[PDB]
């Protein structure tokens, strides 16, 4: 919650790109799940919303973006749907993780990428 860094479109090169080691990006939008291209098929009902980020951060740094208020960021990296966890290692991308997961599976993804 207090470890969350809210970002903007022009403030992406300063916050996440140029950083110390590992930096993640939770591409949320409060419509936890839903797609991009046709904003006609989406879902606000579902309840797998994962706020687990205020917990694994406490266990590196993780950022946080909203594409309804930042439609400039997602199109650059070809994010065709959320939530997509893009891992920024040295101002680049190591691995991506589409379709939400529990705390045991988010550990499985990280621990096969940091050390």
């Amino acid at each position, epitope marked *: 919650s207090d470890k969350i860094i809210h970002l903007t479109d022009d403030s992406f090169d300063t916050d996440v790109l140029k950083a110390d080691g590992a930096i993640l990006v939770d591409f949320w939008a409060e419509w936890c*799940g*839903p*797609i991009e291209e046709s904003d006609d*098929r989406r879902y606000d009902l579902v309840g*797998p919303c994962k706020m687990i980020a205020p917990i694994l951060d406490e266990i590196l740094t993780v950022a946080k973006l909203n594409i309804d208020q930042n439609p400039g960021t997602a199109p650059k990296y070809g994010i065709r749907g959320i939530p997509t966890l893009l891992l920024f290692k040295n101002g680049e991308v190591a691995a991506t993780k589409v379709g939400a997961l*529990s705390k045991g599976q988010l550990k499985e993804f990280l621990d096969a990428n940091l050390a």
Partner: antibody
Amino acid sequence: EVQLQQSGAELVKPGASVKLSCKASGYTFTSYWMHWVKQRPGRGLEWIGRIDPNGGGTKYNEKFKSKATLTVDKPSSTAYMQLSSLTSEDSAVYYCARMWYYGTYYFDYWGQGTTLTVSS
Amino acid sequence: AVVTQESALTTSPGETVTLTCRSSTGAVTTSNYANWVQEKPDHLFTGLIGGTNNRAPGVPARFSGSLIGNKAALTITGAQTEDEAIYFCALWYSNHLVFGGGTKLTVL
């Protein structure tokens, strides 16, 4: 409007290969995964694999890793599945299901199926 | 792993039936993402539930998903005559799906 239609009733020899198609329409093809299932009499269902049409990433059942080969064609919206080294065990009605993966995993739209008969 | 279901259950119009979906490894959790496909006569498949409780678009609200004890479940509150179908389930283990034998629901 969403529809999944697969190829017609095939007849193939043992030892050969076969390619089953799955035309997808009424939606953006590259926004949903595409599973494939095997239905034999008295065996229920059997997962073969899935494919993300955005990137062509694949995951398989351990039993069907050497058997199946899932690919896609973005222009024609057609998903694919190539069964190789066909035997009498491969004689089954193969469907293609759609999956919403964003936030959770649920099926929704299935095809009518394609009856494959491996006869010599 | 081996997913298990009831062979066949019986119910009537208006009644509340409950199907189950055991796992051989242990208990069914939120990690398993319990799915529930429906097979009406003449091979008409359609996904009802997935991720333990989240319905698909257009699926009747009576089909609800839960976790009763050590197994996933599918409660049909107010069973219709059209519901007469084979209800398979499907649990995830290490990114691989495992279907069950199916449950022949018969509505009088």
